[PDB]
């Protein structure tokens, strides 16, 4: 039950390769397994790129199938995609992933202490709730 379709104008997130972590629009189709791609505002050159590597989102900035890079830059700024991106939850769990790699040892210790406490509180409240449901039953 397909929801996202490869349509000229659709935005894709680059999984791996040289241009990792970058957003980019599908300009055109060559064949079954190879497409013309360009992302002017994110510092990615006009180039070929196979569908294998990419994984498409639910945004479709509108432009003609052969439109030269000018009209794309204007349409991109016009829609203001980058901000809606940063609003998406996706990017947030990406930044979390990265902060977790960046995790310092001192922060790691402060975090362990925070966990320890937050979980003792939860344990207390949950046990009172279970006795409460028994009280409700009784």
């Amino acid at each position: 039950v397909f929801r996202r379709f490869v349509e000229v104008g659709r935005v894709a997130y680059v999984s791996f390769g040289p241009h990792a972590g970058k957003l980019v629009a599908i300009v055109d189709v060559i064949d079954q397994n190879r497409a013309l791609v360009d992302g002017p505002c994110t510092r990615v050159r006009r180039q070929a790129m196979p569908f294998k590597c990419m994984q498409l989102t639910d945004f479709i900035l509108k432009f003609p199938h052969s439109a030269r890079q000018k009209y794309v830059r204007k349409a991109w700024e016009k829609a203001d995609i980058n901000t809606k991106w940063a609003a998406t939850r996706w990017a947030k769990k990406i930044e979390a992933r990265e902060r977790k790699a960046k995790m310092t040892d001192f922060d790691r210790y402060k975090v362990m202490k925070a966990k320890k406490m937050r979980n003792r509180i939860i344990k207390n409240e949950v046990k009172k709730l279970q006795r409460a449901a028994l009280l409700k039953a009784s």
């Binding site: 397909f2 996202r4 379709f5 490869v6 349509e7 000229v8 055109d28 189709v29 060559i30 064949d31 013309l36 006009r46 070929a48 569908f51 994984q55 498409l56 199938h65």
Partner: protein, 176 residues
């Protein structure tokens, strides 16, 4: 000739050297697809040898240059004419591929001829390469792509980085 990596296109010209009979022989140009100027010069000599009274020793090569793609970001539909040797017999072809560059296309031809006919690279001679317009394109695999509102999904998505866990709990999904 092994077609390693991806070909270039080279503009070779050459001639027979002067003689007392004829002081200024005519120049001859070709369009060699080849990885480098060394194998280019060799193949040039083979074709000239097939057509004209001319060897490498009796002559000299005047100029070998690389020739760039003058329109590399436009997409094109190339039309190739062939000449191949079967196990038994020889046969002419006309084949249409859909690529951006002459070199990328010629590569794709080599790989297709290899798949579909087990034709080894040495047997094959390239005789004409013409960029051809969508109107004049005959083959339906090409013809189907000329449509403004092309649309298709990615249905079954085989996983890559299979071994990076090698051992998980959750069975992997492939539907998004």
């Amino acid at each position: 000739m092994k077609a390693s990596g991806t070909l270039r296109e080279y503009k070779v010209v050459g001639r027979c050297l002067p003689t007392p009979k004829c002081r200024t022989p005519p120049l001859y140009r070709m369009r060699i697809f080849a990885p480098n100027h060394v194998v280019a010069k060799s193949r040039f000599w083979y074709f000239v040898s097939q057509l004209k009274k001319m060897k490498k020793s009796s002559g000299e090569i005047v100029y070998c240059g690389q020739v760039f793609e003058k329109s590399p970001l436009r997409v094109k539909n190339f039309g190739i004419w062939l000449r191949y040797d079967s196990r038994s017999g020889t046969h002419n072809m006309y084949r249409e591929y859909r690529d951006l560059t002459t070199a990328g296309a010629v590569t794709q031809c080599y790989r297709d001829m290899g798949a579909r006919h087990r034709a080894r690279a040495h047997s094959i001679q390239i005789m004409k390469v013409e960029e051809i317009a969508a109107s004049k394109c005959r083959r339906p695999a090409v013809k189907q792509f000329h449509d403004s509102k092309i649309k298709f999904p990615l249905p079954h998505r085989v996983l890559r980085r299979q071994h990076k866990p090698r051992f998980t709990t959750k069975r992997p999904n492939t539907f998004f």
